[PDB]
Amino acid sequence: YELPEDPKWEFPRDKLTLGKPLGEGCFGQVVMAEAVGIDKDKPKEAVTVAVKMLKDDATEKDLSDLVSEMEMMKMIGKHKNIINLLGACTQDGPLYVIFEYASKGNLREYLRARRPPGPEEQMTFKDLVSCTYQLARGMEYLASQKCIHRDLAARNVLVTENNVMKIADFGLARDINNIDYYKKTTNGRLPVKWMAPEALFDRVYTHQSDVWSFGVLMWEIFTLGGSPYPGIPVEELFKLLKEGHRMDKPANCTNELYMMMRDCWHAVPSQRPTFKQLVEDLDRILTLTTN
Ligand SMILES: */C=C/C(=O)Nc1ccc(/C=C/c2nc(Nc3cc(C)[nH]n3)cc(N3CCN(C)CC3)n2)cc1
Numbered sequence: 703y704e705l706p707e708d709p710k711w712e713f714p715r716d717k718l719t720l721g722k723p724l725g726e727g728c729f730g731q732v733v734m735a736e737a738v739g740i741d742k743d744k745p746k747e748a749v750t751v752a753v754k755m756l757k758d759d760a761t762e763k764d765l766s767d768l769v770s771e772m773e774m775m776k777m778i779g780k781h782k783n784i785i786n787l788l789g790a791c792t793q794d795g796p797l798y799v800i801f802e803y804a805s806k807g808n809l810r811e812y813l814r815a816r817r818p819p820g821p822e823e824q825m826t827f828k829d830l831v832s833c834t835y836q837l838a839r840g841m842e843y844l845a846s847q848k849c850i851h852r853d854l855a856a857r858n859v860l861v862t863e864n865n866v867m868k869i870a871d872f873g874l875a876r877d878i879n880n881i882d883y884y885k886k887t888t889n890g891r892l893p894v895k896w897m898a899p900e901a902l903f904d905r906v907y908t909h910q911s912d913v914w915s916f917g918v919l920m921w922e923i924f925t926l927g928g929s930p931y932p933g934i935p936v937e938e939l940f941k942l943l944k945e946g947h948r949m950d951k952p953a954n955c956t957n958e959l960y961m962m963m964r965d966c967w968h969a970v971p972s973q974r975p976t977f978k979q980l981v982e983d984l985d986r987i988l989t990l991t992t993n
Pocket of ligand 1: 724725726727728729730732752801802803804805806807808860870
């Protein structure tokens with residue numbers, strides 16, 4: 703029927719001017735927009751924002767996933783490495799969910815564009831470790847709010863004008879307690895190649911599962927946007943993972959950083975590092991690459 707009123711987050715429709723699509727596709731559409739007075743301390747300034755909305759062919763599930771995501775953003779609160787929810791238009795028209803605009807797009811594309819020949823300038827090692835640290839800080843914050851993301855991956859990280867990493871796409875994110883444990887139907891919409899064995903084999907999802915996906919994200923980063931498990935089709939992956947198969951070291955990556963990835967991929971979930979442990983180790987490594 704209708705969405706309950708949340709005045710704390712409501713933004714007036716007549717102050718929002720939708721602009722050009724940024725993408726379109728499967729779940730929903732994202733559109734640039736000018737929002738006048740969305741920073742309340744400056745009520746007459748128009749700020750460039752990004753608006754998520756439904757497409758024409760949207761389904762009931764599509765709508766409830768958009769609602770879901772907006773709800774989750776409100777609950778987790780604010781962090782420098784998480785995309786900022788600015789407001790929503792929930793009343794008397796299409797659901798618009800308003801986010802800060804990250805100028806440089808998703809990390810996967812940003813990284814591929816900066817591959818050495820054969821905005822364009824080759825990434826340095828220090829840059830790749832920084833990016834990694836930022837994302838580990840975001841995830842550390844997330845875990846501490848009892849939220850699992852479930853869909854960590856380069857395509858789901860946005861990059862601002864100042865090259866700040868923001869974890870985005872909270873469509874599938876859940877409170878740790880709000881998982882339907884052991885049920886056949888659970889975790890059926892997570893990209894197989896980023897997903898921990900136990901999310902499929904056992905139908906559970908813990909922070910230790912997000913750590914697995916972080917490992918895959920790290921490999922993505924150090925390959926400058928490579929596709930996980932090159933040339934292994936999704937249909938064969940799990941039998942391989944069960945057998946102990948793991949991706950090889952990227953070239954632009956130190957033995958130490960690769961050992962961290964392999965740690966994130968420990969078969970036993972409790973044997974993987976915590977996000978807190980990852981943050982500490984990445985700090986040490988970054989502080990030392992800088993000096
Ligand atoms: C299922 C396929 C599909 O729909 N893929 C898809 C979804 C969404 C997008 C949008 C990408 C995007 N987003 C931003 N910025 C942004 C989004 C949000 C919530 N906040 N900021 C920016 C960009 N670009 C800016 C840089 N350009 C060179 C490329 C696009 N893209 C795309 C595909």
